[PDB]
Symmetry: D2
């Protein structure tokens, strides 16, 4: 079909071999992306390295100007990009357009945030009297070449969240979108190409993991690896990074702790939106409800009728529950469903699969003995775990190897804050479903959920180092 | 029989096996330290993890109080600790006492800095109108268990630089001093024991690398590795750490760029001080002079004479040049000296070695094909490299795999700042020798020199994470 | 008599005339303080201005060391100083000792905060491309001579809160304690004298307002006026200061808003402590309760019995309620009491006065027509105003000319924050009485309550200015 | 003729009386502005007070969007506004258009700077162990109604520097342009009207000082006074403000210190540009040269030749030297000239006045006895004061009642920094003429030059207060 090309050193390049991409919801051929060689990756890196000095030499306002233009182009082509993105990752069309819009928003915000990254002046006299004439002028500097790897669920948005912060600070980029999402990633590249950023500043890489997977990370040209994906690959990247800085956004199994004094209707609505969005294919999402026994029956019934209201179908029809990314993912989800059922869990909503389209399932009576209580499904299945104390909810919650976010539903805020402190997660939302939401806020995880702090200002400081110049006055 | 003990969970413990430590200069037996088994390391970690919650539960001021007490004790016992330190690593007595004082200074400063790590409140309305009532209360939290490993050249100072910043924030510690320097590390431990920190908060580990080296780092109880040592072991740690946070301070080959308008006497004075301090056994130290040809002859003559004025002898005599840490090191340094001489470099001092005491030597006309132009000696040998332009000096300086610090001797400050920007190092001192000096300043190194930003405040930030609590205002 | 002396330019000086000071609770002569002339004030100012450059020239750590020494001395002498303070301002004995401890805490904290006031480096390229090589090195500097004036209720504590932050930054001090409290102020001066600060750095001023009141403020030598006192005196200082920087802490009429979902026992306990501490002679203290009608009867009954539990008597007996500072104050408070009584307010405690000792009294059914609803009594009298909605409570609270702090008692935090945003005050405490509490927190008041932001870091920032050095990099 | 109207509460309003404005260079009538009454001022303030809560209730991004729109309109009409601005204040056309561009720049920057308003979270445990569960959530709030008063020399630019920072934070504005510059001010008002900001958020006031001068400042509805103008008027506002926060930008007598090692040609060019810009009608401008005797003759000759190259004439011809603002201004300048001449000063360039057009004059041999050595002329007259030491230069410089900025021309940077620390000014430029330059940098003056710190972020911080909410975690 349409043969897409990689953007390398200001030029569009096809490769000798290609990878055909198909729509998860229909199997229809979407087009093809290049299957790059290691030699081709070498060229991308060499081009970026050559271009970095001149890019860093520009003023901050000039780099922000380029980024603003990119965002403007995305807004202009949001329908065009959204249409393909919707088809490529089986995401509802309007939701796909939303991803592009949020990408433009983050890119603009990072542009303005990045030009406000001030330095500091330190006094020697603060530490020792003899060094009172000694001052340190410390300023921020880019790390060099940043390798950005986006995920299939947010191939464009979670690409811009890494790209914009890196670029504003003077770093150059090598963007590797997920294969299932590479066409959308190359469409994102078109915006950078049209914006006119100097050749070599922004480049893209597409190909098979077996061929270039480790190669792109182990390459000595790369000064920083910013990745969103599976924990297994994140672990491997950490090792391959060696001593080089990294940022990892891995899995999540966000717990929603529900106390006896919680607004059950508000809780139920939040749990529904958080758990079933994009068919549960989101890292930050309610994946387990730890509810006090006395209010469990009532909450569960409220959630059951709300699950029945969810639409199920195709991405072009903006259905709440769309087909999962692939067959293997759907099979994995079933294994979890089977395990729970076999161990005694109660499916309160119909268990049905058509192709890779699994209907939303509410599982009550879920125990810690079930895989569903621990493993991230990335499917439309929600387990309810009944607890008898806040202490139990906290131990169950913390036992997870994941620690992205948590939700606390209660009307006792001081208590909510105390519980929040004990929870091994990056962010705790009080009376609200978990969310990366409001991109200026920090986004991070504890334990196996990741490494490094995201959020615009934080991602900016992460991909920058400092240069200290010390001298004596008089 | 002067068998030192590890401090584990509030108690002093011997091990089945011991490691006898000898004075590098006289060969005299100083005593022995425990050769811990893998199971004993397990207990240390179990003890720390068990006590971490209660330690974090204390107020910041209480943790600072404990730290100030440790500093007071170190100051009180500076002569006694310095006496043993001097003998253990063949460091001049006065310099050994100074290391203890600086350790007390860093501990006190970290205690107070850590009390002031303010949190931040973010507005949802800054990014999205619909989220104007949503705010994020972001506060710092400890990472858990920090594994601190100090170097032979500063077993106490570069132990406290890790321990204090970690402790003030709510982290617990497992301290691994270098084997040659473990007695001194255990002396530091005594101060922590006398200060009365809760059992398990501060613990020590001693043993053979062949038995516990990898084990202490690969242990999943460890949440952070803070290390100062060889680049080879540093690389290994990066891999073994996985995706866990690390701080690494590895080698250096600091260049002293001398321009035509430099104050030659001042430049000579600084070069000598920096190059030969502790017989060149310092990471931050002038290890190569890149001098403009026109002033080369004059500078070299000054340095030549100053080298011959350096005192050579024993630690108890406060000699500038003392015996190197061990035989293997002296063999290595002598090999470097011979390589330069055999290759035709102009030796300006006799080549002389007695035991592991290598007399200071200056080499002029050092070329890029000579090992001394690149390898970190950790010995009293200084290469002079003549350049034709600042352009050339910058190229040679940046060619090194090391990038700790650099010195620039010139009276043209605007141009000095311009050169600093291009130099791939952490800190650039103008008209002063390189130095970690004034511990509130950032201490870091580009390329293979390390990972992470040191200096008191930066160390605290590095060993802490963030917890964000988000809620809507009504 | 026991004649005290002023500390001026490193020497203790008596004046031609003096002022005899008597104990408010007994009438016994406590001693005398100098009644300075305008020429003696000129010398004090001349001495400080002369010593300022050398004081500014010292390192930050040196100035911090001097301050730590002062705090150490105050801690040693807390009982000796507190005993006289207790007698001088009729404050409970143990409470007076607590004030000296708090002063030492403030001094120590300010010393450590002030050595960490980092500077910043700004980039011209953030604003315009043509200025990308232009940077601004911005560092803090002292304002010069600071005139610190403490209040009668905290002559030592509210002296240290101004003196320490000013001194650490490099400013010199002229300390004017209140006449009734001048002996205690001079005792504080002894600690500074023993600490050994350079002559002229710290000086005291004592005398009659009719002779030097306006003179000390109008003097051109003074660069900053930091005052705590009556709203009237504060109002004229703002005028007399011209365009010179000032800090004013004036009266308050803190409201405690009690909602229907409040924990009444906790509310009653806090209101009692806040309203009656030091017989109501505190700027930050609950001075009016705005309670929802539904819970009014129960709350009032609780507060009623708790007032009857308050100890009444002499300062030496640690009574909760001690005699007021003077006759004029007691007459004023008795007039406010009679106004409420004659107008029909429900007195829930007997009206009694012995000497200048007014017994604690609670008034319910207080209307806006009564003086007690608006005027700051600085006496042990608490009005209860019944409201029918939080809207009404907010209207009433904001109607006051005062806006220092406010308390909100409720279990609905989101709503509490929303109400806080509408209240015209500096600080809002949720489920706790108002308080200057933990001096690291900001302390400020809207409207007639003052000007400037206090609390340690804020006080330092306020008494310092900025110096920006701009240069181009080559 | 062209009758201009004030923008009041979303409406354009004319007054019963009017003030006709004439061009300073031609005497030709440009039009008229309303001569407001105290009652009309009352309405404007009432309007803004009513609209403030709703303006404050909007999200930060919404307020930034309004500001960006204003900036875009300004850029669109930069030639139209610049045309009138040029004639109204006798400023060269291109310079007038340039003023408009900088205004849109400051507004855009303030919008994005303010958008990033974040508070802080403080720990009670940092100060007291007993308060470890107590935290302070500190957030910024607007002060309310800001009275912005711009100067004749920058009626639009120095209106926007006050307006945008105020508006982004949620404050409402009352804009009082200078009578001679009110038409241009009302033209700026058109952009705010077209951008569609809510009625009452932005309002304008014009009229006679004898009628509304003091009224506008004394008014109780005003919460902050931001003014740029004469020192005398500033002193008046300082008193009239009482305890209310203000920002004052007053006179300047910027000294240019020239050392023996200065690049004389660069120095001369800078002095010429800074001293003669807008015929010397700038606060931040080289107003006195303190040059070392040894290089004085050479520098003076260079400056003399460059003065003769300056153009003299009409605004529409972009002349460097244009007629002064009014007759009294020109009379004052002539008085300063006479004094210097009568006292022995040497006029190296022709003394000539036609109308209010005074040709550029270079005065050599100027002494401290002459008025021209101290008073701000606001005319094209530059005095050279020869010194024999840096010590004398600093003394002469600091003796001034003004302390806005200063320039140091020397190649010895460490010394330059040491001198900078000694100079009583807000900003020191090394080897560059003084300038408010890059509005992100702080702009402030010492002594009689003003009050408060300007520069975008600083201006935003000044017109905002803080609201602290304190609670204990359970």
């Amino acid at each position: 079909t349409k043969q897409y090309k990689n953007y390398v050193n200001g030029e569009w390049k096809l490769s000798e071999n290609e990878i055909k991409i198909y729509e998860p919801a229909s199997g229809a051929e979407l087009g093809s992306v290049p299957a790059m060689s290691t030699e081709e990756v070498d060229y991308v890196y060499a081009s970026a390295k050559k271009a970095q000095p001149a890019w860093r030499a520009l003023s901050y306002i000039e780099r922000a100007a380029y980024l603003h233009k990119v965002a403007d182009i995305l807004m202009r082509d949001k329908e065009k990009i959204g249409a393909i993105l919707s088809k490529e990752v089986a995401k509802g069309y309007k939701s796909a357009v939303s991803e592009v819009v949020r990408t433009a928003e983050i890119i603009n915000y990072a542009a303005e945030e990045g030009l406000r990254m001030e330095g500091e002046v330190l006094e020697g006299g603060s530490f020792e009297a003899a060094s009172k004439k000694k001052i340190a002028v410390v300023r921020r500097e880019p790390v060099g070449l940043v390798l950005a790897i986006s995920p299939f669920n947010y191939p464009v948005n979670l690409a811009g969240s890494k790209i914009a912060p890196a670029l504003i600070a003077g770093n150059v980029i090598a963007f590797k979108p997920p294969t299932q999402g590479s066409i959308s990633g190359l469409l994102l590249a078109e915006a950078f190409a049209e914006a006119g950023l100097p050749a070599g500043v922004f480049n893209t890489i597409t190909g098979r993991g077996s061929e270039i997977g480790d190669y792109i990370v182990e390459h000595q040209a790369v000064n920083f690896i910013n990745f969103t994906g599976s924990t297994g690959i994140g672990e491997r990247i950490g090792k391959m990074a060696g001593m080089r800085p990294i940022m990892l956004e891995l899995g999540g199994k966000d717990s929603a702790i529900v106390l006896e004094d919680a607004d059950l209707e508000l809780t139920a609505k939040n749990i529904i939106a958080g758990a079933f969005g994009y068919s549960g294919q989101r890292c930050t999402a309610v994946k387990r409800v730890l509810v006090m026994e006395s209010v469990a029956d009532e909450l569960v019934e409220k959630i059951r009728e709300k699950v029945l209201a969810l639409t199920i179908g195709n991405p072009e029809d903006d259905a709440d529950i769309t087909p999962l990314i692939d067959t293997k993912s759907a099979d994995y989800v079933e294994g979890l469903i089977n395990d729970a059922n076999d161990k005694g869990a109660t499916a309160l909503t119909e268990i049905k699969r058509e192709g890779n389209l699994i209907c939303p399932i509410l599982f009550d009576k879920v125990t810690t003995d079930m895989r569903l209580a621990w493993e991230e499904p990335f499917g439309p299945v929600l387990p309810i775990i009944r607890v008898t104390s806040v202490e139990e909810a906290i131990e169950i919650s913390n036992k997870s190897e994941y620690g992205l976010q948590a939700s606390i539903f209660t009307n006792d805020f001081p208590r909510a804050f105390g519980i929040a402190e004990q929870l091994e997660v990056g962010t705790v939302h009080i009376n609200n479903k978990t969310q990366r939401g409001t991109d200026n806020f920090p986004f991070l995880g504890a334990k196996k959920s990741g490494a490094g702090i995201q959020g615009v200002k934080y991602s900016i400081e992460a991909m920058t180092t400092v240069k200290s110049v010390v001298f004596d006055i008089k």
